[PDB]
C-alpha cells in the first residue's frame, strides 16, 4: 500500500512536505500520483493530480514531484484554511490504493478562551420528565476542556466527554455538554451551575 | 458543471442488499476514459476503494471483495447504481461515488457524502424541544435557542432556523454518543437578543431516516 | 570576518546567479523591515577562518 506520516506540523509562512512511500509498491513504475484535501465535515476535493501539473482552479501554493519512488507534496504559504487530510492515491496491479492519512498542524495562533452557555430548560420537558439542561462550549484553541457540573457539590460530567474537534470556518475547536439531571433531583437542585476548565487557564 | 448527488435508505436492517444509487448530472459517460466509481471511508481511518464501472461495461471491482460488490450502469437515466451484500457491522461509513475522467485524474469531482450506520438498531422517534431563551440568556449576552432533538440512532440529520434565510448564526455542532446508544443535538443560533421575541424560530430537524419534520418554537419562560 | 556567506534565502538558486542584494529574510503574519527582529535574519553570515 501507501504509508503516510500520521502528524506534521507546519509555521505560517514555511513550507512542509509530505512523503508518501513505497511500502511494498507493486505500483510498478508509479506513473501517476494524486493527492486530495478532506476538511472535517466536507467531502475530499483534489488539489494535484499527475504532479508533473496541476488541475484547473487550485493555487500555486500546491506543487508535488516524485524523485525516485516517493511522492511529496510541497505546500508553500501555509495559512489558517489549510489544516486538513491529505490523502495519495495511485493505480496498482489490480485495485487502487488510497493510502493513509495526514493531518496538518498549523501552530502558531493565540490561545481563545471558551464562553459558556447555560441555555435553561424551557417549560415543556420538565413536565415529562426529561430535564436535559445543556452547557454547551465552543470557541478555544486547545481543544481540551473539562465541564465541572455541579449544583454546589461534587463535580461530575457523566456524559460531556465526546471529543468533537469541529474545525469550522474560525479554526477553533468546539465542546458538547450534556447533562444527566434525573428528572426527580430538578427540584432539590438550586440552579446547578456550570464551570469549565480549560488548557493553561485551569481557573 | 459536475454534480454527483447520493441517495437511497441510510438505514437499514443488517445483513441485507444496499441500494446506494449515485445521480449524475452535467456530463456523458459514454466519453472515452470516463467512468463512475465508489469509495469508501470508515470514521477515523483512509479512504479505500470498492467498485469503478467503465464506458464500456466494464465493471471492475476490488480484489477482496468480489461477492458482494455488483455495480450497474442506467446511462438512459443517468443514475448510477451500486449493490453491496453481507452486511457486517464493519462496513458503516460514508460512501463518496466520485467521476474518473482519465487515468491522471484520479477521481476529481467527488461527492457529498451518505453515512450508512447499520449495525444493530433501527430508527428512533425524534424528540423536538426548543430551548427557551430566558433572561440567563439574554442578560447573559447573546440569547442562543437551541432545539434539544435527541432520542434517534441515525447520525445524519440537518437542521436550520429559519429555513431559506439566517445561513450563519447556528452552530451545528456534531451529536455525543451517551450510554443509551443515541445521538442527541443542541445546535443554537448566535442571533443575539435584538429581535427574537415577538418573532419565530424553528431549526427545521431534517432526520430523514425517521420521516418526521417537526417544526415548534418556544416563549420565554422566567426561572 | 572579510569572508560572508549568504546562510538564509528563500528559494534555491538557479544556475549561474549571483545575488549581489542583502535584503533582510521574511516571515509570517508581520512586516518585519529587518533592524533587529528575532524572527527575520541577516542574509548573510561572516566565516570565522582561525
Same mark, same amino acid.
Given at each position: 500500500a501507501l504509508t503516510q506520516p500520521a502528524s506534521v506540523s507546519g509555521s505560517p509562512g514555511l513550507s512542509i512536505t509530505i512523503s508518501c512511500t513505497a511500502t511494498s509498491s507493486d505500483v510498478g513504475a508509479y506513473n501517476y500520483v494524486s493527492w486530495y484535501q478532506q476538511h472535517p465535515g466536507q467531502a475530499p476535493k483534489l488539489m494535484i493530480y499527475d504532479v508533473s501539473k496541476r488541475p484547473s482552479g487550485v493555487s500555486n501554493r500546491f506543487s508535488g514531484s516524485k524523485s525516485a519512488n516517493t511522492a511529496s507534496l510541497t505546500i508553500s504559504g501555509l495559512q489558517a484554511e489549510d489544516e486538513a487530510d491529505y490523502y495519495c492515491s495511485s493505480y496498482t496491479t489490480t485495485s487502487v490504493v488510497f493510502g493513509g492519512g495526514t493531518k496538518l498542524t498549523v501552530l502558531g495562533q493565540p490561545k481563545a478562551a471558551p464562553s459558556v452557555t447555560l441555555f435553561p430548560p424551557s417549560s415543556e420537558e420538565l413536565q415529562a420528565n426529561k430535564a436535559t439542561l445543556v452547557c454547551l462550549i465552543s470557541d478555544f484553541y486547545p481543544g481540551a476542556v473539562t465541564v465541572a457540573w455541579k449544583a454546589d457539590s461534587s463535580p461530575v460530567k457523566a456524559g460531556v466527554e465526546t471529543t468533537t474537534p469541529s474545525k469550522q470556518s474560525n479554526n477553533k475547536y468546539a465542546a458538547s455538554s450534556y447533562l444527566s439531571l434525573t428528572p426527580e433531583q430538578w427540584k432539590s437542585h438550586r440552579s446547578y451551575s456550570c464551570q469549565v476548565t480549560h488548557e493553561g487557564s485551569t481557573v | 458543471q459536475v454534480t454527483l448527488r447520493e441517495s437511497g435508505p441510510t438505514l437499514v436492517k443488517p445483513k441485507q442488499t444496499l441500494t446506494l444509487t449515485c445521480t449524475f448530472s #452535467? &456530463? !456523458?459517460? !459514454?466519453?472515452? *476514459?470516463g467512468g463512475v466509481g465508489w469509495i469508501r471511508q470508515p470514521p477515523g481511518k483512509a479512504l479505500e476503494w470498492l467498485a469503478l464501472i467503465y464506458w464500456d461495461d466494464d465493471k471492475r471491482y476490488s480484489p477482496s471483495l468480489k461477492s458482494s460488490l455488483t455495480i450497474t450502469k442506467d446511462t438512459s437515466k443517468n443514475q448510477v447504481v451500486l449493490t453491496m451484500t453481507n452486511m457486517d457491522p464493519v462496513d458503516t461509513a460514508t460512501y463518496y461515488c466520485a467521476r474518473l475522467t482519465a487515468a491522471d485524474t484520479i477521481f476529481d469531482c467527488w461527492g457529498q457524502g451518505t453515512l450508512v450506520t447499520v449495525s444493530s438498531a433501527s430508527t428512533k422517534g425524534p424528540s423536538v424541544f426548543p430551548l427557551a431563551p430566558s433572561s440567563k440568556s439574554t442578560s447573559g449576552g447573546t440569547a442562543a435557542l437551541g432545539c434539544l432533538v435527541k432520542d434517534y440512532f441515525p447520525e445524519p440529520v440537518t437542521v436550520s432556523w429559519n429555513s431559506g434565510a439566517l445561513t450563519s448564526g447556528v452552530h451545528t455542532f456534531p451529536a455525543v454518543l451517551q450510554s443509551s446508544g443515541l445521538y442527541s443535538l443542541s445546535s443554537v443560533v448566535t442571533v443575539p437578543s435584538s429581535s427574537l421575541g415577538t418573532q419565530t424560530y424553528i431549526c427545521n430537524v431534517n432526520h430523514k431516516p425517521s420521516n418526521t419534520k417537526v417544526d415548534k418554537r418556544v416563549e420565554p419562560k422566567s426561572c | 570576518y572579510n569572508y560572508l556567506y549568504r546562510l538564509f534565502r528563500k528559494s534555491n538558486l538557479k544556475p549561474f546567479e549571483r545575488d549581489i542584494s542583502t535584503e533582510i529574510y521574511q516571515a509570517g503574519n508581520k512586516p518585519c523591515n *529587518?533592524?533587529? #527582529? &528575532?524572527n527575520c535574519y541577516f542574509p548573510l553570515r561572516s566565516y570565522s577562518f582561525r
Amino acid at each position: 500500500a501507501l504509508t503516510q506520516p500520521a502528524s506534521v506540523s507546519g509555521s505560517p509562512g514555511l513550507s512542509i512536505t509530505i512523503s508518501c512511500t513505497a511500502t511494498s509498491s507493486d505500483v510498478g513504475a508509479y506513473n501517476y500520483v494524486s493527492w486530495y484535501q478532506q476538511h472535517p465535515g466536507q467531502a475530499p476535493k483534489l488539489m494535484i493530480y499527475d504532479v508533473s501539473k496541476r488541475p484547473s482552479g487550485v493555487s500555486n501554493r500546491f506543487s508535488g514531484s516524485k524523485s525516485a519512488n516517493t511522492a511529496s507534496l510541497t505546500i508553500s504559504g501555509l495559512q489558517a484554511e489549510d489544516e486538513a487530510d491529505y490523502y495519495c492515491s495511485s493505480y496498482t496491479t489490480t485495485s487502487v490504493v488510497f493510502g493513509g492519512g495526514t493531518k496538518l498542524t498549523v501552530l502558531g495562533q493565540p490561545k481563545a478562551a471558551p464562553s459558556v452557555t447555560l441555555f435553561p430548560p424551557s417549560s415543556e420537558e420538565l413536565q415529562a420528565n426529561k430535564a436535559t439542561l445543556v452547557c454547551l462550549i465552543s470557541d478555544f484553541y486547545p481543544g481540551a476542556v473539562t465541564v465541572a457540573w455541579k449544583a454546589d457539590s461534587s463535580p461530575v460530567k457523566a456524559g460531556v466527554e465526546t471529543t468533537t474537534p469541529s474545525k469550522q470556518s474560525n479554526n477553533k475547536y468546539a465542546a458538547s455538554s450534556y447533562l444527566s439531571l434525573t428528572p426527580e433531583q430538578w427540584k432539590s437542585h438550586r440552579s446547578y451551575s456550570c464551570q469549565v476548565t480549560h488548557e493553561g487557564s485551569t481557573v | 458543471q459536475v454534480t454527483l448527488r447520493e441517495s437511497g435508505p441510510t438505514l437499514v436492517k443488517p445483513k441485507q442488499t444496499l441500494t446506494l444509487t449515485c445521480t449524475f448530472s #452535467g &456530463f !456523458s459517460l !459514454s466519453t472515452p *476514459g470516463g467512468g463512475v466509481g465508489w469509495i469508501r471511508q470508515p470514521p477515523g481511518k483512509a479512504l479505500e476503494w470498492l467498485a469503478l464501472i467503465y464506458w464500456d461495461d466494464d465493471k471492475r471491482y476490488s480484489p477482496s471483495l468480489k461477492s458482494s460488490l455488483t455495480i450497474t450502469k442506467d446511462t438512459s437515466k443517468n443514475q448510477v447504481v451500486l449493490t453491496m451484500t453481507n452486511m457486517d457491522p464493519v462496513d458503516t461509513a460514508t460512501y463518496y461515488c466520485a467521476r474518473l475522467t482519465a487515468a491522471d485524474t484520479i477521481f476529481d469531482c467527488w461527492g457529498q457524502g451518505t453515512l450508512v450506520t447499520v449495525s444493530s438498531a433501527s430508527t428512533k422517534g425524534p424528540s423536538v424541544f426548543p430551548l427557551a431563551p430566558s433572561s440567563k440568556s439574554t442578560s447573559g449576552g447573546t440569547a442562543a435557542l437551541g432545539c434539544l432533538v435527541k432520542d434517534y440512532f441515525p447520525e445524519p440529520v440537518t437542521v436550520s432556523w429559519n429555513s431559506g434565510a439566517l445561513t450563519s448564526g447556528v452552530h451545528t455542532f456534531p451529536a455525543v454518543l451517551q450510554s443509551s446508544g443515541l445521538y442527541s443535538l443542541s445546535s443554537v443560533v448566535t442571533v443575539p437578543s435584538s429581535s427574537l421575541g415577538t418573532q419565530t424560530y424553528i431549526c427545521n430537524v431534517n432526520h430523514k431516516p425517521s420521516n418526521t419534520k417537526v417544526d415548534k418554537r418556544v416563549e420565554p419562560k422566567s426561572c | 570576518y572579510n569572508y560572508l556567506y549568504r546562510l538564509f534565502r528563500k528559494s534555491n538558486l538557479k544556475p549561474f546567479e549571483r545575488d549581489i542584494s542583502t535584503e533582510i529574510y521574511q516571515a509570517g503574519n508581520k512586516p518585519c523591515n *529587518g533592524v533587529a #527582529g &528575532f524572527n527575520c535574519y541577516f542574509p548573510l553570515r561572516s566565516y570565522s577562518f582561525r
